[PDB]
Design a binder for this molecule. Structure first.
Ligand SMILES: *[C@@H]1O[C@H](CO)[C@@H](O)[C@H](O)[C@H]1NC(C)=O
Ligand SMILES: *[C@@H]1O[C@H](CO)[C@@H](O)[C@H](O)[C@H]1NC(C)=O
Lengths: 270, 103, 221, 131, 213, 121, 112
């Protein structure tokens, strides 16, 4: 027949640069989850995301998750550059016992949890201009305290606000205080947002509470790499194409192994 | 569309035993499974969230696990107070319930 | 009705580690910071750090970054402080205090205070010696006499005269650490000079940690 | 803490409309992270979820009931009600009013929408009979 | 880190009087300074926070004032219950720094110390260590100071002192100084004396004894 | 079998533009990316950028962005490089090289390097 | 950029015996995938370059088994078991762990 219908069950390590997220989801590696600290300055043609990947840091959700995942995956890099943000009047490097970095409390390595300094929490109004020649991706978030008492204790203001703005657009997020079900012993949550800062544009972070500040930017590039969900193991074989079921020979005019494919292999037919 | 079977329907165990309750989803539901305990004559209690996260006041002997299609609720040391029906829940569908009975 | 209940006193050898506890009641434990303060004589209070039990957010004084470690058991409404690599300098009283926004983060509710003593000395009973009155002069005015309790460990000793019959006019001075590592203490009473002859006074000393009870007869010269 | 307490007629004639009201104590029905839901329990079929109501007015009902259910809030009294049109003999069951919520946590690679019912009422038996 | 200087460390007053405790911060702490009351047998009490806001349940006679680097706690019409230790604690910067604290003691008329000296007992000597102790009884104020004299020579470093708190019955203090000498060292000297200097004494008081008596 | 024949020697005045081509024969043109490499004697070997003929997606070395643009004609299986604003430093030998993997692949076969010399003579 | 160095103006290699060419990188070329993304390209005189080794210890289709490469960290070596008259040329070490591609200066073999 002219239809390929069987995969070897493995993903060839060549020629595409496969990066295996053993226990890490792309976003987990992006934020710097404690068990995902091995992904730094990474590169890939195809990020393989295992169905068994799990998060182990602070519980969080990503509004507009698909867009961020697609953007980062298409970038083909996780090059993170630290920036010297000047957070005056707030305590930095906040953490939680739900995110065990070492033996004690910890947090995402790429996010900066700002907390009240002493008995006050000023209106942060920092700004980092993008004088470089590449798009900068800033990952920040807004913390959602479980109670009004927790909100005031962490952040002196009774109701916080995060306004990240640039020339193109702005996002204003108001935290939703309330008790959620425990996840690793926490009834609070974190929402992760992202902002692309084009060259010559300026990032403006204005906040009076609940800001999970960024520590820097991810150097974005206009790549064509991709991300794929697959439990197939990676073997030292060679195949010009990859499918979630694994590599498939790409010589036949057609294939029906999967509709999702990466690389140069035939058109899908039901 | 999503349907999900909880087995066994009712199992007999004795105090101090290790008991495992299995709830199987027809499709991969990630970790979107919650476990509820209902002692007779009471409303169900919210035990485990996201298939592994124990809730406030739930004894540490309870533990949930699994991902994808197969989930398990395990009680390390069945105590007298743990006699109750256990329901796995995924969004709007509740499992058929495991009438855990004392031997 | 808010109170922060703290564990009892401790005795640790140098280099050991102790875990102080502070049980909170009367309020939602997870919402307020729990402060930890160190008090030792001659230095006043000294802030160690704080932990927000709900999130586990901790923030330490730089002077205590590695020494102390806060944890909170949310199910028990208890906050813990683990002191590590104890030294003689850590002998102090440790307070846990509640801190929240209603009081603008001034720690408004305090614990009773846990006293931890770091000392390598071996437990031993007091040695009692008499302070016989009429040192150079025979008699005059009101006479003073006492018993020197020396070289005991650990604290505290209790001293009474004539089994409580002479509680009036008796001063029991605080015990002082000696360079050897053993506490020493003095108890003195003022009596009429005439009472010296017709009466002999007994210094009652009891050191429960050593289960030692001593009664000493003090006579002039 | 927050307590839920449902009330209403325990007996309803067939083909009528069933009405129940859950009054929330210690909390506000106007919260924007919790939905308020009604779950039905009968011995022969286990727990069945009827639908849920949000303060903003969004609602969701399971298709198993052909739009017979309707959940609405009365925020001036901290109440939400269940209206189950054209009741039948099969609708006799214990009705629980439960607080819940919807979350999209990133717990696992495959993101899934999680519902929970963390607070439940005592449950009230509702009989549907011609007696 | 903000050093907090609290003065006066020792304050004497009587009921009905008005007193002020000055606390100074090494750098501006805006208005975030709190005052605590520590007294034996009970938990520390928060009196004032944010400079002037007195805590609920605190009597109105406690008043706070100041901003920036200078602050003041004013207690008017002192009650007998107000005599205790007071601490100023800034909560503006993050490493909370408390002041040294001021002891607030009840005033009284000056009283001279009764000086007694006790030679080391024979039982003490048989252990090989001697401990001569000189005692001051029922004096006021707390500023009494003593120095040991053995023969003509002065001795220092080898003596320990301890002072009891105010005796509520008469508001006076008592002080004991013990000089520790080994049997050999004790035997090398003949006459031992303790010099007592106190504001209530017209001239310093000397009590002395000769070895063997 | 797989060969990548390029254009011959090009002479163009400074500031002008030239359109180098690379005829790819012996394989399915749309199934392999194309890389372009610049060689100047002594100075070494320099990478310009890569193009995916399937959809004309291109990624350039920064120092060559704008200085050159890559494009393909899928019908004739020919890959084109256009140089613009030429200067003396642009005198070089340009190699079109087949790519075996994706964006991060490696030069699998190199074409017959086309030399370009800049000057009016 | 990752800079590749190929200090090899004249590598004396008497014909017949083994020869070695050394390349060094300012950054480790080992990817998190376990592969080292070094490449060795041979440019025979008057000819376009051709691939000898891709990554390491992986040979091209037509490359003889004579060529073998290995290394660790940031220093790599190309070892030729036997050198023939046909192996004279410039051997560029290239890396693409981080784009853009960076080539070494190229080492020219000289025979004794
Ligand atoms: C905040 O920063 C922006 C940009 O640096 C500036 O225009 C503005 O005046 C600052 N202050 C406020 C209150 O926005
Ligand atoms: C490939 O995997 C998908 C999803 O797991 C499945 O639907 C499909 O049938 C698989 N194909 C083969 C050939 O196994």
């Amino acid at each position: 027949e002219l239809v390929q219908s069987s995969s070897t069950g493995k993903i060839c390590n060549n020629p595409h640069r496969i990066l295996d997220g053993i226990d890490c989801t792309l976003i987990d590696a992006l934020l710097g989850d404690p068990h995902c600290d091995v992904f730094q300055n990474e590169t890939w043609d195809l990020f393989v995301e295992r169905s068994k990947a799990f998060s182990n840091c602070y519980p969080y959700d990503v509004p507009d998750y698909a867009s961020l995942r697609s953007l980062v995956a298409s970038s083909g890099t996780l090059e993170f550059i630290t920036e010297g943000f000047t957070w005056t009047g707030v305590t930095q490097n906040g953490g939680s016992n739900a995110c065990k970095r070492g033996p004690g409390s910890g947090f995402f390595s790429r996010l900066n949890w700002l907390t009240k300094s002493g008995s006050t929490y000023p209106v942060l109004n920092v700004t980092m201009p993008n004088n470089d020649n590449f798009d900068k991706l800033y990952i920040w978030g807004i913390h959602h305290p479980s109670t009004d008492q927790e909100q005031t204790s962490l952040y002196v203001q009774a109701s916080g606000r995060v306004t990240v703005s640039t020339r193109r657009s702005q996002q204003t997020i108001i935290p939703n205080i309330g008790s959620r079900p425990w996840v690793r012993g926490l009834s609070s949550r974190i929402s992760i947002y992202w902002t692309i800062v084009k060259p010559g544009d300026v990032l403006v972070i204005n906040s009076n509470g609940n800001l999970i500040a960024p520590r820097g930017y991810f150097k974005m590039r206009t790549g064509k790499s991709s991300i794929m969900r697959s439990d197939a193991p990676i073997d030292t074989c060679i195949s010009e194409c990859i499918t979630p079921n694994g590599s498939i020979p790409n010589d036949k005019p057609f294939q029906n192994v999967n509709k999702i494919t990466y690389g140069a292999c035939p058109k899908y037919v039901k | 569309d999503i349907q999900m079977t909880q087995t066994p329907s009712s199992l007999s165990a004795s105090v101090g035993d290790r008991v495992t309750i299995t709830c199987r989803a027809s499709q991969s539901i990630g970790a979107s499974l919650n476990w509820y305990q209902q002692k007779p004559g009471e409303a169900p209690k919210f035990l485990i969230y996201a298939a592994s996260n124990l809730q406030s006041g739930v004894p540490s002997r309870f533990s949930g696990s699994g991902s994808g299609t197969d989930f398990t609720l395990t009680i390390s040391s069945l105590q007298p107070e743990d006699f109750a029906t256990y329901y796995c829940q995924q969004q709007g569908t509740f499992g058929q319930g495991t009438k855990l009975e004392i031997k | 009705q808010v109170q922060l209940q703290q564990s009892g006193a401790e005795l640790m050898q140098p280099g050991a580690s102790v875990k102080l506890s502070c049980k909170a009641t009367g309020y939602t434990f997870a919402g307020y910071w729990i402060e930890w303060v160190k008090q030792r004589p001659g230095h006043g209070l000294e802030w160690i750090g704080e932990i927000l039990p709900g999130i586990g957010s901790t923030n330490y004084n730089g002077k205590f970054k590695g020494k102390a470690t806060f944890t909170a058991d949310s199910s028990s409404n208890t906050a813990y402080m683990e002191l590590s690599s104890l030294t003689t300098e850590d002998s102090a009283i440790y307070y846990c205090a509640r801190s929240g926004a209603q009081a603008t983060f001034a720690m408004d509710y305090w614990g009773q205070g846990t006293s931890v003593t770091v000392s390598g000395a071996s437990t031993k009973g007091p040695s009692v010696f008499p302070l016989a009155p009429s040192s150079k002069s025979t008699s005059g005015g009101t006479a003073a006499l006492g018993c020197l309790v020396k070289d005991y460990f650990p604290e505290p000793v209790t001293v009474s005269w004539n089994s409580g019959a002479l509680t009036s006019g008796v001063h029991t001075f605080p015990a002082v650490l000696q360079s050897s590592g053993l506490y020493s203490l003095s108890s003195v009473v003022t009596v009429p000079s005439s009472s010296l002859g017709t009466q002999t006074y007994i210094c009652n000393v009891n050191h429960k940690p050593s289960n030692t009870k001593v009664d000493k007869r003090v006579e002039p010269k | 803490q927050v307590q839920l307490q449902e009330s209403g007629p325990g007996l309803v004639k067939p083909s009528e409309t069933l009405s129940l009201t859950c009054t929330v104590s210690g909390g506000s029905v106007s919260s924007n992270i919790y939905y308020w839901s009604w779950i039905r329990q009968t011995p022969g079929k286990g727990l069945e979820w009827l639908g849920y109501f949000y303060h903003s007015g969004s609602s969701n009902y399971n298709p198993s009931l052909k739009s017979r259910v309707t959940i609405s809030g009365d925020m001036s009294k901290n109440q939400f009600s269940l209206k189950l049109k054209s009741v039948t003999a099969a609708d006799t069951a214990i009705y629980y009013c439960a607080r819940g919520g919807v979350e999209n946590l990133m717990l696992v690679a495959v993101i899934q929408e999680m519902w929970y019912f963390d607070l439940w009422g005592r449950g009230t038996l509702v009989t549907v009979s011609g007696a």
